[PDB]
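pipeline/complex-builder :: batch 7 item 3
reading input block
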Amino acid sequence: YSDVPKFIRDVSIKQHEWMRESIKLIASENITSLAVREACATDFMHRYAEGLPGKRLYQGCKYIDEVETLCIELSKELFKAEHANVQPTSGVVANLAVFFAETKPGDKLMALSVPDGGHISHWKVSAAGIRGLKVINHPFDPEEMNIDADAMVKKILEEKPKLILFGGSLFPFPHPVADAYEAAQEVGAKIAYDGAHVLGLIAGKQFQDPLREGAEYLMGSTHKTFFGPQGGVILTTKENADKIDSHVFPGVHHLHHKAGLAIALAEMLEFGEAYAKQVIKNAKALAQALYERGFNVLCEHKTESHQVIIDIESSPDIEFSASELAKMYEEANIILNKNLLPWDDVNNSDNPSGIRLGTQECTRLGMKEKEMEEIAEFMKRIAIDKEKPEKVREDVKEFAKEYSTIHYSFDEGDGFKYLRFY
Amino acid sequence: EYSDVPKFIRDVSIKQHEWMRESIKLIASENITSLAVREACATDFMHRYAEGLPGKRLYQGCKYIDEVETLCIELSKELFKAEHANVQPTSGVVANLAVFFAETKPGDKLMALSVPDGGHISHWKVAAGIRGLKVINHPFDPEEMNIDADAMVKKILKPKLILFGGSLFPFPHPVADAYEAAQEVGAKIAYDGAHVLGLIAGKQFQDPLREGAEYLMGSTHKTFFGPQGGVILTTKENADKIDSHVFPGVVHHLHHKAGLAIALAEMLEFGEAYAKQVIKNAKALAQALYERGFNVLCEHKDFTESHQVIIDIESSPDIEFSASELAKMYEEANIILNKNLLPWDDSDNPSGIRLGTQECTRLGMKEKEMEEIAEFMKRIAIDKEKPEKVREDVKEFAKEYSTIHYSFDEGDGFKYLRFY
Ligand SMILES: *Cc1c(COP(=O)(O)O)cnc(C)c1O
Ligand SMILES: *Cc1c(COP(=O)(O)O)cnc(C)c1O
């Protein structure tokens, strides 16, 4: 009882230094700056917003109104939505909320299959599996990795869906939210876009542009590809002002998270274009250099995103499985995932066909083309060649430790720094 | 100008504490977090993801985490003495929702405490209107505030579920009365312990899981000093049931739960010492309250068995106002209170109010300090002393001792830490 909190402290600092020494390439992982990380630990855990500023029923919320209004207006500026609500406590809550507002049973929810680039929300035992029920797979073709809009518009056409979503876990190139609009608007099927995975790239005016391309809704997690802490955010048309704001609370919040959200949101406001551009630029040539070192990286005719896709099974000179690489990588101080590919036979697996990576956190750490071209080395060494994994850890742990800094922010601190409250 | 924003809220943050450490905070849905708990919130865990239990991730790099999740789980076992627990839920409404999704179908009857009946939202629709629907209300007794047990059992006789707990929660709900009545109609029982459970961790209020509850869900905000999130304590039969029921269900916040590890850790040790004195001081609050001549709910029953004192602000000796009116009056008197709509409320503006002693209690203040709080409220409610000059006599109190007890290391609970 007594000594365990300092033991959690132990695995905490161990965590910190591990993350400093290791480089982290993960699709869903982004780093928080010091302003927002400090701000998340403040007393804003104390109170609650209980709905919107000016609508409270609880007292002492006065400052919370200011910060919430500030980030609402900030995102209203950034993503250029005519409405925004920052209340969702996570991305999945944002999903559940925009569903609960924009859908009921009455069938189709159109989204990617899980190995096909889906994420676990829309399908059952999750968001809209809890709400919408009624799910259908998106016409994803594995060769050029993206949705084929023809079959999509067809399914939307004769088979008459009431709602359609875009975005996902596997997201190499912008999904056709533009071409789907005709049939979607025809049947009375709304268009929503989960921005989470790409949420930063769109703020930096790269990749896709959902709202100008006809999307009525855009929502997602602020902790991935965007500098914010853990939580969700919703952005939409201004006729939904009284709708989605109602369907959150009782759809839900965590106020410290919203504050850090605001700070990181302004970091994204000022430094976002440079950041995002640098991110995709940190992606593409990483994929190329990785394709030089003998891997098989998919979309060889292209990625416009921050995430990269590798198929290990078909990749020769390796002849390993995905997790087979993933583990040794994890103890090599280069950490990625275990991820399915649309080619995968069936899904019950500890060992898929390949791996999916991302450049975002390293970019916030400052890494550029040279450094990721040097990431290609550490990556390649274990698969082809296959010299000792833990041997190159003494090399790698002394590599990433050089950048402790948080870039594309207004301050340069130590991102892996641990601060003693006691 | 964006360059000036991180300076903005970190001012409003260092002012935030500054308000709350000086102000006396009576809001019952809120609590103070210890430095040990608060420290883990800033850690790199903010960036991570871990899948179910124990490790079983579809990602990697969780090597240290597969242990810490298990640490929170064990700390939720040997504490509540529960056969199983899952600390993964990212919110009280997330935990609650995962429970509603666990055993139910759309259309399945769910017996729960209604909002006008004096219970929290998410028990009734517009969450709880998401997957399963048709929620029915417990028989209530406006006179003596509680559930009505006889008519409860008679009413059960055919639901799918039974729900207890609420934001307005004066008295322990009759779990045992609805226990044997639940099983023969093929229903189950889920106790929502959000506003209580930390008290149950300190062995007070009631003992739901041993009173027959097959699910116990709770928020780590209310009556739990610690992070934001939910927690689900259930039978060992339901282990992988609820473990799987969420982690497709809601996708993990690791920094917070890393704080929850500490939270539980000190919850085992100091749980009783905190829990007893919570109510023992709260009854001093209520006793002074009535000894001043106030009109307060359950005048006979000592106005609560819980941390929440409920004053009817309609038909009160000095009002001729809204309840929310006096709420704001005390608000800028730097006494932080909360609206509570009473069962006789036909609504923002309530008949009642709800007062927690939690933030005052973890600070380690006792009965006569609660007498002081009472007197502070009498400064306004009675003698019509200006709330702003009274605020000076408010500032002397909570600012005097700002250090929280009942954890391990006593620092300033509101102490601000500059990062960069
Ligand atoms: C990545 C992602 C998440 C991640 O979990 P959070 O709830 O955001 O913490 C959730 N939902 C969607 C749609 C995502 O893409
Ligand atoms: C207090 C309470 C909650 C709180 O959950 P949040 O995560 O804070 O929104 C939920 N349900 C009930 C029944 C409660 O009493």
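note: Chain A has two domains: 33-269, 270-422.
queue -> next item
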